[PDB]
């Protein structure tokens, strides 16, 4: 119904901190919810949730509401929270003395920990009631609250300290930049790989068997540009998974699929060349068209058994508190695995291809200077392994360290290393498609 400028600022405050959903969803304990955390019912009936929603909105929503309708529900929750604050002898004196911006910070805390929870901050509250902003900020920065949710606590505390919305303005700008940056990464992956796939598809002289292996690489790198990297970017710019527990588990398995198919194909290409460059005449008398396709179908078969089988069977799940907290939270899509899956998948996806590629490309060049007595072939070796190593080894070292000592690998670092590997899907078409009949092919496609 009736909205205000103060009303709307609190709304946009918590859309950043908690998120907005215009369709009915489930909360951490399975209850139907909509808007910004508005509980519809505890009943295990979607139609029951819809009737409660329709009575509250005043329209036949069928589970789908608008933003303005979400603010109607939200301002009712704010009204209720304020109404209980004034009934609380611990919170009413502080609330009565605060300006509108800092009242929003206090309401934000109540939405996160409950009225009773926030009323336990008696010393911070005394300091806020006396307008001792910097002392209250220091004190709040030592809280259990701060150590549990550092990012949200920093934004709320900044709001208390300054009485401005600067923390939330800085978040919107940060995300918007990462949105453009990752949107660029997405299309470099897509364009570079869709350009390779059709160049093979329509040019008759590019159907070699070494290029038969390359378009399996480019197609594994293409699914990642279309499905894995985009939905991976929503987690970074929003701090949450927005697409439900089921798509979390499907997205996760598609991620480990494409990366397993991609890296193992780099391994097949690695030995393919060797087998073709050291003994070319045996090579053709050994690798038929069926055998070449036999390898790629095996790679994708191995990749499926590393990705969809164990993840859908829940063979990967850890058994700790943050493991179970994330499994119950449909907004958390962290890949909290156990030690055996973390190690087994890393060996199949990355470690055995790394050391096979390291061995193959090494024997290529020792048997090169066995006849010269050049480095334009060494520097090609240098980057084929150099780019592949810098993109994926930082992540799988951190992956195995985290699998033994969780506290050593912070999430930020862990997510950055994974994005280094994501960038390899854009680097590979640049690396493995530089033949004169690739170069002359791409020119023909875009002219």
């Amino acid at each position, epitope marked *: 119904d009736y909205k205000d400028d103060d009303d709307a600022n609190i709304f946009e405050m918590l859309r950043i901190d908690e998120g907005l959903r215009l369709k009915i969803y489930k909360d951490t304990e399975g209850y139907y919810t909509i808007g910004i955390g508005h509980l519809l019912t505890k009943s295990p009936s979607l139609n029951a949730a819809k009737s409660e929603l329709d009575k509250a909105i005043g329209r036949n929503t069928n589970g789908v509401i608008t933003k303005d309708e979400a603010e109607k529900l939200f301002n009712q929750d704010v009204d209720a929270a304020v109404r209980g604050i004034l009934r609380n002898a611990k919170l009413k004196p502080v609330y009565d003395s605060l300006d509108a911006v800092r009242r929003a910070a206090l309401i934000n805390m109540v939405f996160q920990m409950g009225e009773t929870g926030v009323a336990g901050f008696t010393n911070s509250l005394r300091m806020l009631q006396q307008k001792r902003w910097d002392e209250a900020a220091v004190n709040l920065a030592k809280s259990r609250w701060y150590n549990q949710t550092p990012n949200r606590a920093k934004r709320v505390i900044t709001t208390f300290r300054t009485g401005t919305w600067d923390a939330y303005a800085a978040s919107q700008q940060w995300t918007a930049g990462m949105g453009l940056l990752m949107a660029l990464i997405v299309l470099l992956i897509v364009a570079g790989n869709v350009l390779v796939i059709v160049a093979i598809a329509k040019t008759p002289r590019l159907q070699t068997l070494t290029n038969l292996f*390359i378009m399996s690489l480019a197609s594994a790198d293409l699914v990642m540009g279309l499905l894995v990297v985009p939905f991976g970017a929503t987690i970074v710019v929003w701090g949450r998974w927005e697409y439900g527990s089921f798509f979390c588990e499907l997205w996760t398995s598609v991620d480990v699929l494409c990366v397993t198919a991609s890296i193992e194909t780099l391994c097949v290409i690695a030995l393919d060349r060797y087998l073709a460059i050291t003994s070319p005449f045996r090579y053709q008398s050994l690798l038929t068209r069926a055998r070449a396709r036999g390898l790629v179908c095996t790679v994708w078969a191995i990749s499926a058994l590393v990705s969809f089988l164990p993840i859908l069977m829940h063979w990967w799940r850890a058994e700790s508190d943050e493991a179970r907290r994330c499994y119950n939270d449909p907004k958390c899509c962290d890949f909290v695995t156990n030690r055996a899956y973390a190690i087994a998948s890393s060996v199949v996806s990355f470690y055995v291809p790394l050391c096979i590629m390291a061995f193959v490309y090494l024997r290529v060049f020792r048997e090169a200077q066995k006849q010269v007595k*050049e480095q334009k*072939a060494l520097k*090609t070796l240098g980057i084929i392994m150099g780019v592949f190593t810098l993109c994926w080894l930082p992540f799988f070292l951190a992956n195995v360290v985290k699998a033994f000592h969780r506290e050593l690998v912070p999430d930020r670092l862990f997510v950055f290393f994974n994005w280094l590997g994501y960038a390899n899907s854009a680097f590979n078409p640049i690396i493995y498609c530089r033949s*004169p009949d690739f170069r002359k092919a791409f020119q023909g496609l875009l002219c």
Partner: nanobody, 120 residues
Framework: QVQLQESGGGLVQAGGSLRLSCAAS????????MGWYRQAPGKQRELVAA???????NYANSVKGRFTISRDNAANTVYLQMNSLKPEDTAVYYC??????????????WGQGTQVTVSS
């Protein structure tokens, strides 16, 4: 920066002998394949004999050892001995080298050709 220089052609009667010489001027990568290709009018291009820098060779099936290809290490030069020649061998012969400096794909240098015609 690297060109193939080829010699040894001409005309000979049936059951004759020639030795071909192909010098690969300039420096190129150490793993490679030197070989020979021919194409008669009407027919289309065809391998006859190739040799790898390690030593592995491969002859066509129009050659029952009558032709023997061989390199000469320390020199980018491959030779092809043509013995027991039949009138079916009239074709322009081409010297080819498979360069492997780029590791993902082949690089092909071509000699321009030497005519070979045989009479019965």
């Amino acid at each position: 920066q690297v060109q193939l220089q080829e010699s040894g052609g001409g005309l000979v009667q049936a059951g004759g002998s020639l030795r071909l010489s192909c010098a690969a001027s300039g420096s190129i990568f150490a793993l490679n394949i030197m070989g020979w290709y021919r194409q008669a009018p009407g027919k289309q291009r065809e391998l006859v004999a190739a040799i790898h820098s390690g030593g592995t060779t491969n002859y066509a099936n129009s050659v029952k050892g009558r032709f023997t290809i061989s390199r000469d290490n320390a020199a980018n030069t491959v030779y092809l001995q043509m013995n027991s020649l039949k009138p079916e061998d009239t074709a322009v012969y081409y010297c080819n080298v498979k360069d492997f400096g780029a590791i993902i794909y082949d690089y092909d240098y071509w000699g321009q050709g030497t005519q070979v015609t045989v009479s019965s």
